[PDB]
């Protein structure tokens, strides 16, 4: 189980943060990742962080306005949205996965490179900016 | 307390229903109102039902696409939505209020009309429509 948490509204230029908590602990070769859907759509990856290291990958669309960060403790980590518009409306999957080795943690960034998701958190960010 | 379900994203022109069950049995005065609220707007009267006789009464921006239904069995209600569209986008809140003696159900239009209140659901619209 990949526990989900933190869905809402905001308004375009809003930030919101998401949270995905895992039932079992991480190790050391534990990946994160987030995807999104809106209706009619593909899930489309959005970033991901490598549990050891916390080194983290974006895709182009959310690079340097949203972070990924790892909270050891609750066994969580957070994906923190910035500067959000209308078209990262969607809902959001956190996913984990066990790197393989001779891999790159950054070329996780596919749905099947994923066996493990959780149940998805609606974001909604209206037109109306702040 | 007023639970509610149903929240989720759908398609442009799809159809989806929120549910409300009250804790309490009704009785022939409980009356049930919907209101949605997106952020940058007010919160906004949908539409309510009478227990006592199915009497239902609209927002002028969803009659003819939303059908709210009595659940007797459940103690609850139903707000059917169709033709949706990303103007109805919002998060929809369910309300309860006991009808004072005077005035019609119909009249239970207003957000202080409505001292129970639900917790919210999320609903949106895609821009994206159906392929059928």
């Known amino acids: 189980k990949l526990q989900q948490s933190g869905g809402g509204m905001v308004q375009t230029g809003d930030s919101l943060r998401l949270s995905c908590v895992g039932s079992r602990r991480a190790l050391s070769s534990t990946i994160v990742g987030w995807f999104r859907q809106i209706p009619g759509k593909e899930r489309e990856f959005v970033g991901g962080?490598?549990?050891?290291?916390?080194?983290?990958w974006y895709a182009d669309s959310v690079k340097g306005r949203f972070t990924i960060s790892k909270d050891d403790a609750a066994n969580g980590v957070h994906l923190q949205m910035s500067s959000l518009k209308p078209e990262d409306t969607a809902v959001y999957y956190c996913?984990?996965?066990?790197?393989?080795?001779?891999?790159?943690?950054?070329?996780?960034?596919?749905?099947?490179?994923?066996?493990?998701w959780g149940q998805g958190t609606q974001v909604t960010v209206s037109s109306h900016h702040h | 307390k007023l639970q509610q379900s149903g929240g989720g994203m759908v398609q442009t022109g799809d159809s989806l229903r929120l549910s409300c069950v009250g804790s309490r049995r009704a009785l022939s005065s409980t009356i049930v109102g919907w209101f949605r609220q997106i952020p940058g707007k007010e919160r906004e009267f949908?539409?309510?039902?009478?227990?006592?006789?199915?009497?239902?009464?609209?927002?002028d921006s969803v009659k003819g696409r939303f059908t709210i239904s009595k659940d007797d069995a459940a103690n609850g209600v139903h707000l059917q939505m169709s033709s949706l569209k990303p103007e109805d986008t919002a998060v929809?809140?369910?309300?309860?209020?006991?009808?004072?003696?005077?005035?019609?159900?119909?009249?239970?239009?207003?957000?202080?009309?409505?001292?129970?209140?639900?917790?919210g659901t999320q609903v949106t619209v895609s821009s994206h429509h159906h392929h059928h």
């Open positions: 962080i490598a549990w050891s290291s916390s080194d983290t």
């Open positions: 996913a984990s996965a066990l790197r393989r080795p001779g891999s790159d943690a950054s070329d996780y960034t596919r749905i099947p490179d994923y066996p493990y």
